[PDB]
DNA sequence: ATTATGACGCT
DNA sequence: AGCGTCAT
């Protein structure tokens, strides 16, 4: 009763740019706006690989991880923008720089955790307290929540009108003189996220979706419920119904092998079905940490903090060499290591100037032809100078003895991936 | 030939 | 440290 934690202590949002690389290209090229459009990497093999898709194009069945030639079969009028190529490889600088535009705006409102190039968690607990104090017990108008969905409502015929019906039910029910009502806190959080999203669109042109809830996992889940250009409030009370038909794989961290094992071992399908196991039962199958996490998570409770981190922890450069393009000679391997290192040096030097830090470790990863995993080998060495020729030489030295070829020049088995990653930053 | 990233966990 | 998982 009065002692069972309910995980309602925080207000957390997750902001996710809509089809982000596509929006970056549509801002730059107005001809692409409001069209079925996708962003592609490379071009020669099957038209290039699609890595982002506008919502107009998704309606035709275009997806990421699709060849452009195949997407054109589904959507003959599909427009394409190509990722920049520099030094023989895809170069994502435009999108990283657009990301910084958005992250810096979000940071004006609250502390953020950079989750990916186009998504950030927002810790709104303090901002909500402040806005509540300023509101002086004034009711919250629907006008302040023009793009908000309240998950689970309406309960007990435009699409927009059902949004409004649900919002009206929620607001009509809200108790406002309790400054500590979790539902009220979430609602004020949603007001702030409307403001944040309006600022992002005003100041960058970019639209986004967002989730507002009491923790990162629910905020992430919420964000995906109403896309694009909308935000969703998932209250603590909404969790039992929401989870009752929610496939386990939809919850962040459960979309892979662990989630599959939860399903197989327990013989369940939906997140809510987890509530029938004891904490010790779940720990016995999935380990102490996962078991405790699952026990709380299936009740809507998670404690992972929004980490105060706006900048990436690593700066990396990688290229696959699939099929016949696999690197089979010394000079080929060296040359591509150099290309990678030159991009790495450029990005590192900019990072040092912008962010007052220096990387101290270089991680070198490769894949050999006919190998199991993403990485066949991972080796680290010191990163003492931002110099591409040096880093490339060092990376070679580190991967030297992978070459089983007794022949001097030849490289066997051929390399299907090269990866340089700068890590272990220190203030400078 | 489902590419180029990036964070975090395990031992 | 090096490898594996999960995700964008
Ligand atoms: N698998 C993969 N490879 C390369 N680039 C990716 C990949 N996934 C995402 N991205 C890039 C391209 C995206 O514009 C960007 C954001 O990823 P996400 O959020 S999953 O998808 P978006 O393109 O923003 O559409 P969406 O969020 O509106 O569903 O990261
Ligand atoms: Ca996105
Ligand atoms: Mg996304
Ligand atoms: Mg995203």
In SS3 terms, chain A reads as CCCCCCCCCCCEEEEEECCHHHHHHHHHCHHHCCCCEEEEECCCCCCCEEEEECHHHHCCCCCCCCEHHHHHHHCCCCEEEECCEECCEECCHHHHHHHHHHHHHHHHHCCEEEEECCEEEEECHHHHHHHHHHHCCCCCCHHHCCCEEECCCCCCCCHHHHHHHHHHHHHHHCCCCCCCCHHHHHHHHHHHHHHHHHHHHHHHCCCEEEEEECCHHHHHHHHCCCCCCCEEECCHHHHHHHHHCCEHHHCCCCCCHHHHHHHHHHCCCEHHHHHHCCHHHHHHHHCHHHHHHHHHHCCCCCCCCCCCECCCCCEEEEEECCHHHCEEEHHHHHHHHHHHHHHHHHHHHHHHHHHCEEEEEEEEEEEECCCCCCCCEEEEEECCCCCHHHHHHHHHHHHHHHCCCCCCCEEEEEEEEEEEEEEEEEEC
Torsion from C-alpha of A199, A350, A384, A90, nearest 10 degrees: 90
- Whole-angstrom distance, CA of residue A146 vs CA of residue A248: 31
- Specify burial of residue A276 (Cβ count, 10 A radius: 0-12, 13-18, 19+): exposed
- The residue behind tokens 């002692």 is A3
Q: Which nucleotide lies nearest residue A89, CA to C1'?
A: B4
CB–CB of A208/A121 below 8 Å?
Answer: no
Cβ neighbours of A27 (radius 10 Å): 14
Q: Where are the domains of chain A?
A: 1-18+89-247, 19-88, 248-305, 306-428
Indicate if ligand 1 lies below 6 Å from the C-beta of A17.
yes
Cβ neighbours of A140 (radius 10 Å): 18
- Whole-angstrom distance, CA of residue A108 vs CA of residue A54: 28
Please tell me the residue having the least CA distance from ligand 1 atom 28.
A18
Give the number of C-alpha atoms closer than 13 A to the C-alpha of residue A152, restricted to the C-beta side: 15
Indicate if ligand 1 lies below 6 Å from the C-beta of A18.
yes
Task: Please check if A373 is assigned to a binding site.
Answer: no
Indicate the CATH number for domain A248-305.
1.10.150.20
Of A180, A168, A169, A174, nearest to A128 (Cα)? A180
Indicate if ligand 1 lies below 6 Å from the C-beta of A117.
yes
- Whole-angstrom distance, CA of residue A90 vs CA of residue A77: 25
> How long is the CA A169 to C1' B6 vector, in angstroms?
41
Task: Please check if A64 is assigned to a binding site.
Answer: yes
Of A258, A357, A284, A276, nearest to A315 (Cα)? A357
Of A96, A101, A97, A95, nearest to A81 (Cα)? A95
Torsion from C-alpha of A94, A99, A100, A106, nearest 10 degrees: 160
- Whole-angstrom distance, CA of residue A133 vs CA of residue A136: 6
**CA A336, A338, A340, A342 torsion: positive or negative?**
negative
> How long is the CA A144 to C1' C7 vector, in angstroms?
33
Please tell me the residue having the least CA distance from ligand 1 atom 10.
A51
A81: Cβ–Cβ under 8 A, 6 or more apart, which residues? A22, A25, A29, A32, A37, A38, A39, A40
Residue A253 Cβ under 7 A from any strand C atom: yes
Indicate if ligand 1 lies below 6 Å from the C-beta of A151.
no
Residue A63 Cβ under 7 A from any strand C atom: no
CB–CB of A321/A88 below 8 Å?
Answer: no
- Whole-angstrom distance, CA of residue A278 vs CA of residue A156: 33
- The residue behind tokens 């990866």 is A419
A222: Cβ–Cβ under 8 A, 6 or more apart, which residues? A14, A151, A210, A211, A212, A213, A232, A233, A234
Residues across chain A? 428
Top CATH class, A1-18+89-247? alpha beta
Q: Which nucleotide lies nearest residue A323, CA to C1'?
A: B1
- Whole-angstrom distance, CA of residue A263 vs CA of residue A83: 39
Of A398, A319, A330, A388, nearest to A364 (Cα)? A398
Of A8, A15, A188, nearest to A107 (Cα)? A15
CB–CB of A421/A315 below 8 Å?
Answer: yes
Of A230, A221, A208, A232, nearest to A152 (Cα)? A232
A1: Cβ–Cβ under 8 A, 6 or more apart, which residues? none
Chain A residues 109-168 with Cβ under 7 Å of strand C are 115-119
- The residue behind tokens 């959507």 is A75
> How long is the CA A269 to C1' C4 vector, in angstroms?
25
- Whole-angstrom distance, CA of residue A189 vs CA of residue A184: 8
- Whole-angstrom distance, CA of residue A212 vs CA of residue A170: 14
CB–CB of A293/A277 below 8 Å?
Answer: no
Fold classification of A19-88 is MutS, DNA mismatch repair protein, domain I (3.40.1170)
Residue A96 Cβ under 7 A from any strand C atom: no
- Whole-angstrom distance, CA of residue A329 vs CA of residue A415: 9
Q: Cα A149 to chain center, whole Å?
A: 22
> How long is the CA A424 to C1' B8 vector, in angstroms?
15
In this structure, which residues have their CB less than 5 angstroms from ion ligand 3? A 16
CATH architecture of A306-428: 2-Layer Sandwich (3.30)
Indicate if ligand 1 lies below 6 Å from the C-beta of A51.
yes
- Whole-angstrom distance, CA of residue A182 vs CA of residue A236: 8
Q: What is each CA distance from A112 to A129, A166, A313, A358, in whole angstroms?
A: 17, 29, 14, 22
CB–CB of A51/A40 below 8 Å?
Answer: yes
- Whole-angstrom distance, CA of residue A294 vs CA of residue A271: 9
Phi first, then psi: what are they for A121, rounded to 5°?
Answer: -85, 150
Q: Which nucleotide lies nearest residue A224, CA to C1'?
A: C8
From A118, A209, A316, the mutation candidate for ligand 1 (largest count of ligand atoms within 8 A of CB) is A118
CB–CB of A142/A163 below 8 Å?
Answer: no
CB–CB of A290/A270 below 8 Å?
Answer: no
- The residue behind tokens 């690593």 is A314
* CA A145 to ligand 2 center in whole angstroms: 21
Give the number of C-alpha atoms closer than 13 A to the C-alpha of residue A268, restricted to the C-beta side: 20
- Whole-angstrom distance, CA of residue A80 vs CA of residue A36: 9
Indicate if ligand 1 lies below 6 Å from the C-beta of A37.
no
- What tokens does A264 get? 């197989």
- What tokens does A53 get? 């898709």
């Amino acid at each position: 009763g009065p002692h069972m934690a309910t995980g309602q202590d925080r207000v957390v949002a997750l902001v996710d740019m809509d089809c982000f690389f596509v929006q970056v290209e549509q801002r730059q090229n107005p001809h692409l706006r409001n069209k079925p459009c996708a962003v592609v990497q490379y071009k020669s093999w099957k038209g290039g690989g699609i890595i982002a898709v506008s919502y107009e194009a998704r309606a035709f069945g275009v997806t990421r991880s699709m060849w452009a030639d195949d997407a054109k079969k589904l959507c003959p009028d599909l427009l394409l923008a190509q990722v920049r190529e520099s030094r023989g490889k895809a170069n994502l600088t435009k999108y990283r720089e657009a990301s910084v535009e958005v992250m810096e705006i979000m940071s004006r409102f609250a502390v953020i955790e950079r989750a990916s190039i186009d998504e950030a968690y927002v810790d709104l607990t303090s901002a909500v307290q402040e806005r509540l104090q300023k509101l002086q017990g004034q009711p919250i108008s629907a006008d302040l929540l023009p793009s908000t969905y309240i998950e689970g409502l309406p309960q007990g015929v435009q699409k927009e009108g059902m949004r409004k019906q649900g919002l009206f039910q929620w607001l009509d029910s809200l108790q406002i003189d309790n400054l500590t009502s979790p539902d009220l806190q979430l609602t004020v959080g949603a007001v702030i996220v409307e403001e944040m999203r309006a600022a992002i669109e005003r100041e960058t042109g970019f639209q986004c979706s967002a989730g507002i809830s009491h923790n990162k996992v629910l905020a992430k889940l919420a964000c995906g419920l109403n896309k694009p250009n909308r935000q969703t409030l998932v209250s603590h009370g909404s969790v039992p119904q929401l989870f009752s038909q929610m496939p386990i794989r939809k919850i962040r961290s459960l979309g892979g092998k662990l989630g599959a094992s939860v399903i197989e071992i327990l013989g369940i399908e939906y997140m809510g079905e987890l509530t029938q196991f004891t904490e010790s039962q779940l720990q016995s199958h999935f380990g102490e940490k996962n078991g405790s996490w699952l026990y709380a998570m299936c009740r809507g409770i998670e404690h992972d903090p929004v980490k105060p981190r706006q900048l990436p922890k690593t700066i990396g450069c990688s290229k696959n060499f699939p099929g016949k393009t696999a690197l089979a000679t010394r000079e080929q391997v060296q040359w591509w290591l150099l290309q990678l290192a030159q991009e790495l040096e450029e990005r590192l030097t900019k990072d040092r100037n912008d962010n007052d830090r220096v990387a101290t470790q270089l991680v070198v990863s490769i894949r050999v032809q006919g190998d199991k995993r993403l990485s066949s080998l991972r080796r680290c060495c010191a990163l003492t100078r931002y110099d591409a020729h040096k880093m490339s030489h060092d990376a070679f030295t580190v991967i030297k003895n992978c070459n089983t070829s007794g022949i001097q020049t030849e490289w066997s088995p051929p390399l299907t991936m090269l990866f340089l990653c700068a890590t272990k930053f220190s203030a400078s």
